[PDB]
């Protein structure tokens, strides 16, 4: 249960032409340490993956949004739905409890509080 998580799979020898998946990263950790080792810096680093981490997450959706797919009209099943339910639960109570407070006395007489 969650998950296999595929600690072995097919391989060998295909996709041994795939190389320079590290050249992508090896460039940076060379450049990053070329950044990170300097005598005079005293300050944080740009780290763009973080700039594009929030700004492509918090903002930049209602701009990207379109009110079309009915899996984006899904939310009526989520947002409004249970909010009706909680009305259905309560409004029955506060009444069932009220009717008895009139005809018949459920409480004791040492309840002043309330």
């Amino acid at each position: 249960t969650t998950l296999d998580p595929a600690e072995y799979d097919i391989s060998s020898e295909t996709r041994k032409a795939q190389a320079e998946r590290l050249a992508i990263r090896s460039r940076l950790k060379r450049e990053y340490q070329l950044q990170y080792y300097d005598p005079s810096r005293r300050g944080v680093i740009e780290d763009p993956a973080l700039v594009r981490w929030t700004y492509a997450r918090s903002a930049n959706i209602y701009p990207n949004f379109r009110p079309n797919t009915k899996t984006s009209l899904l939310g009526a099943l989520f947002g409004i739905g249970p909010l009706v339910f909680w009305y259905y639960v309560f409004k029955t109570d506060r009444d069932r409890k009220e009717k008895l407070i009139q005809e018949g006395k459920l409480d004791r007489t040492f309840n002043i509080s309330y």
Binding site: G43, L50, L83, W86, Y87, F90
Partner: protein, 458 residues
């Protein structure tokens, strides 16, 4: 009374009239003094409330609430000092003036003697606040926070003045609250709902329901330097108390429709705190606390039957401090590291050891350990709102769980090893860092000793 407005307006030319850099210490010195006057004639009754003039009873009401309002002013100039030292003095003379120009009305309001001085002074802000948000922002998204902050607050508070001028000429004179001694009820019609709905919805748009809060994190996320007016805007909001002056009376007997304001904010209380867990921006993370256990008062106020006002008052000034102070931490830790992104700051608690116990006592008062005001302000909520119907124990019982995972995840994110690349963060919290961060936890917990000074009449 004039004991107050006059010195605090006398402050106004205590500032520019001064010399060069002496200005900050000049006004911070005096601005503390007024606090002796603040208590001075106040904390009289008690019973048969104080009204000392025709159009002012300063605060009698057992809503003292005014002493805080006079605190937060000379907590700003200790707060606001950081990056505001980098532009000109004739502008720095301004930012201290409008900031006072706010403080003068919050003394006028909370007294008001009546309804119609309240309103024109209830709308009399937004001139001083709006000018602090738009200028001296940081990001460029600020320009929209300027509008959204209006077009709600002002949007539906005009229907007040249609209604309050409708009462003035209907029954007698609203000139005075202290005469309601003639009030007829409001039975029903398709007209009276609107009356009750017009005399209400303007207040909700300030202390948010789970709808129409769409502005609250828009203004706080991006907002002035120190939280300079962000401390003030956490006073402004709770100041929607005036619903305590109305809904006690002035259409007492419609509870008929209360339910769409109960089940709407009662399922949001369990809600918007939960949409606060994955936030990646810290001054957002606190902004959604401020909705949550503020929006609990709206189910305290609508229900009648005190033991709610016992507990509803303690809350307005409960987070009045705790929710204030957190915006003071997240400011400081931002001075040194210029991202507000929560992730980036980690591996603290080694490098600033004394500021350890500052986070803790803050994040501990959302947990609300029993002895402090916080619970003794929540456990008069639950005791009456239980009697309403027994089932309220569940949701607002869940609130007491998700809020605990809520707070810790903010502290425990700052306990880790990170040395990482930061050559910054040298300053070991020069005194103002820890001075202005105090004058909260000292006065806050303190009140628990004699906590009969925060209570309503009931």
């Amino acid at each position: 009374m004039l004991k107050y407005i006059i010195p605090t307006i006398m402050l106004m030319p205590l500032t520019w009239l001064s010399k060069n850099n002496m200005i900050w210490v000049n006004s911070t010195a005096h601005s503390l003094l007024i606090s002796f006057t603040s208590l001075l004639l106040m904390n009289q009754f008690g019973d048969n409330s104080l009204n000392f003039s025709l159009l002012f009873f300063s605060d009698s009401l057992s809503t003292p609430l005014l002493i805080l309002t006079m605190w937060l002013l000379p907590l700003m100039l200790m707060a606001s000092q950081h990056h505001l030292s980098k532009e000109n003095l004739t502008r720095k003379k301004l930012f201290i003036t409008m900031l006072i120009s706010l403080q003068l009305f919050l003394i006028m309001t909370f007294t008001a003697m009546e309804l119609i001085l309240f309103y024109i002074l209830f709308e009399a802000t937004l001139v001083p606040t709006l000018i602090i948000i738009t200028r001296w922002g940081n990001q460029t998204e600020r320009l929209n926070a300027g509008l959204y902050f209006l077009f709600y607050t002002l949007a539906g508070s005009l229907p007040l003045l249609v209604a309050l001028i409708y009462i003035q000429n209907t029954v007698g004179s609203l000139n005075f609250l202290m005469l309601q001694y003639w009030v007829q009820p409001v039975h029903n019609s398709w007209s009276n709902v609107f009356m009750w709905l017009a005399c209400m919805m303007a207040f909700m748009v300030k202390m948010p329901l789970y709808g129409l809060h769409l502005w609250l994190p828009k203004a706080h996320v991006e907002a002035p330097i120190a939280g300079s007016m962000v401390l003030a805007a956490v006073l402004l909001k709770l100041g929607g108390y005036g619903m305590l002056r109305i809904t006690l009376i002035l259409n007492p007997m419609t509870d008929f429709m209360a339910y769409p304001f109960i089940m709407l904010s009662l399922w949001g209380m369990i809600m918007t705190s939960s949409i606060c867990l994955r936030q990646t921006d810290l001054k957002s993370l606190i902004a959604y606390s401020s909705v949550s256990h503020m929006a609990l008062v709206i189910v305290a106020i609508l229900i009648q039957t005190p033991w709610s006002y016992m507990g509803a008052t303690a809350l307005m000034i409960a987070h009045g401090l705790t929710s204030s102070m957190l915006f003071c931490l997240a400011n400081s830790n931002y001075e040194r590291i210029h991202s507000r992104t929560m992730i980036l700051a980690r591996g603290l608690q080694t490098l600033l050891p004394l500021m350890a116990t500052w986070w803790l006592l803050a994040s501990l008062t959302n947990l609300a350990l029993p002895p402090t005001i916080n619970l003794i302000g929540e456990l008069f909520v639950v005791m009456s709102t239980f009697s309403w119907s027994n089932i309220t124990i569940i949701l607002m019982g869940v609130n007491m769980v998700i809020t605990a995972l809520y707070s810790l995840y903010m502290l425990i994110m700052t306990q880790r090893g990170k040395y990482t690349y930061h050559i910054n963060n040298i300053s070991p919290s020069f005194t103002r860092e820890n001075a202005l961060m105090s004058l909260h936890i000292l006065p806050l917990l303190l009140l628990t000793l004699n906590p009969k000074i925060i209570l309503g009449p009931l």
